DNA sequence: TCGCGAATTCGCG
DNA sequence: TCGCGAATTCGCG
């Protein structure tokens, strides 16, 4: 990549860095492009901190919590800048999900099944569960103009292309994207609206029917729809792509701290 | 109730119906308060239908569709309405979630947990699966000034008050609502923006932070914080409640309809 | 301690 | 057939 984003880029992939630890190495590479700039990386956000920020849109927001310390967990954690009022704006959360175990199984003389003769596993629905916490982020940042939330997909439930597995019997089976049997793809669409998917989605859109005007937030889902695991490069680079997309919307609140330091 | 509401109600509660099939009965009632206007009970959405209205509003949204025949089946089912220009508006779509079988163990002399020596079982998170089909709707609906999606909970998971179990043995457990071992009523908050539980969050709020405007979708959030299984009776009034909010938001499109007719 | 997350195996039309 | 939904048992700090 372009000068030191390459560096960075080849020793995640020496060591095939998990997402939590390439989000910290995102954190590094911001503040070695910006030096005038603070940032910081979080592993969890408690849900006192979403109800602060619900209360100060409106009113009647946020008044609701059952655990005390309850909280959320991105696996990839959370990036932040310091603008220059003082007060920590969120630049990136990533997380990586994987289900389907099928390429596993074809690969050796695995059957599946409650028989024990199905080359195929019936796709399960747990990926559901994603859209939890890119609502509880999305509250968090109701108030920005732009939504930083990064999902990577892996598995043999998240194909979007054919492929074909051979086992050790010599007997090729063949996959097709399209099957409802194990593509998930779709219990995921409505995340980013339908929009296009391996895309960067961070700025904000804002529609409107009939004179009313609504600001969409919508994450950028990722997939690995050859069927094999994520590169760390490739995910680092996508990554430092959408949190430098943060910072061009954050650019008004951040200008004295490049200009006045 | 309000004259028939209590004669449908009473069916609810002699036979025990699920929500399915209590929103069915919903429509009947609304057929037989507006005799002018016509309702019809769906039991499925396919995912072309959410992204021809989500093309409608923007052009550049719902263009992704993996698995042709893809669709979505909340167990509630969902009621419709026709309006003056022959277009069929959503009033009504229910779902009913269970999760914690505590109270089922402690009332039996079981002890569950690897070792089998636990009153209780660390409560999972399957739960928050239900965001997707919220979701769904919201994208399906994000044309329309209300949002008439209820959730009912139920199981141990789901406490707003201290419950006492006697098991078989005579010793007391004592459940506490608060604890975050058991608790996942949080996992839903997000859902309806910390908003109070257990209310008919049907009308549409439109906040802003510094001049934008937003449209905020609220799923109504139904609980038995007693541990207790969901009386039908209840369930119907709260479904009604709810769907006669909607014809209320879509007044103006039913006008016609209710004089010239 | 307490509270969050992994993601799977099948039943059902 | 094919495609959606139930919701659970524990590991991890």
């Given at each position: 990549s372009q000068g030191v984003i390459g560096i960075?880029?080849?020793?995640?992939?020496?060591h095939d860095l998990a997402v939590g630890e390439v989000s910290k190495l995102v954190k590094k590479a911001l503040s070695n492009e910006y030096p005038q700039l603070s940032f910081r990386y979080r592993d969890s956000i408690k849900k006192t901190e979403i109800n602060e920020?619900?209360?100060?849109?409106?009113p009647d927001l946020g008044g609701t919590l059952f655990v005390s310390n309850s909280s959320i967990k991105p696996d990839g954690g959370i990036v932040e800048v310091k603008d220059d009022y003082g007060e920590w704006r969120?630049?990136?959360?990533?997380?990586?999900?994987?289900?389907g175990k099928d390429i596993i199984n074809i690969r050796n003389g695995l059957l599946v099944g409650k028989r024990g003769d199905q080359d195929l596993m019936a796709a399960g629905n747990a990926?559901?569960?994603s859209h939890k916490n890119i609502s509880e982020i999305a509250n968090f940042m109701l108030s920005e103009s732009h939504f930083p939330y990064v999902l990577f997909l892996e598995?043999?439930?998240?194909?979007?292309?054919?492929?074909?597995?051979?086992?050790?019997?010599?007997?090729?089976?063949?996959?097709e994207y399209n099957s409802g049997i194990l593509n998930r793809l779709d219990r995921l669409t409505?995340?980013?609206?339908?929009?296009?998917?391996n895309s960067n989605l961070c700025i904000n859109?804002?529609?409107?029917?009939?004179?009313?005007?609504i600001m969409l937030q919508?994450?950028?889902?990722?997939?690995?729809?050859?069927?094999?695991?994520?590169?760390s490069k490739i995910m680092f680079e996508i990554m430092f792509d959408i949190s430098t997309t943060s910072l061009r919307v954050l650019g008004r609140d951040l200008f004295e701290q490049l200009t006045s330091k």
């Open positions: 960075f880029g080849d020793y995640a992939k020496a920020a619900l209360k100060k849109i409106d969120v630049v990136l959360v990533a997380e990586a999900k994987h289900q990926i559901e569960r598995g043999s439930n998240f194909l979007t292309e054919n492929i074909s597995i051979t086992r050790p019997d010599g007997r090729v089976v063949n996959l409505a995340a980013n609206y339908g929009m296009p998917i859109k804002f529609v409107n029917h009939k004179d009313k005007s919508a994450a950028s889902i990722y997939t690995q729809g050859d069927g094999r695991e994520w590169d």
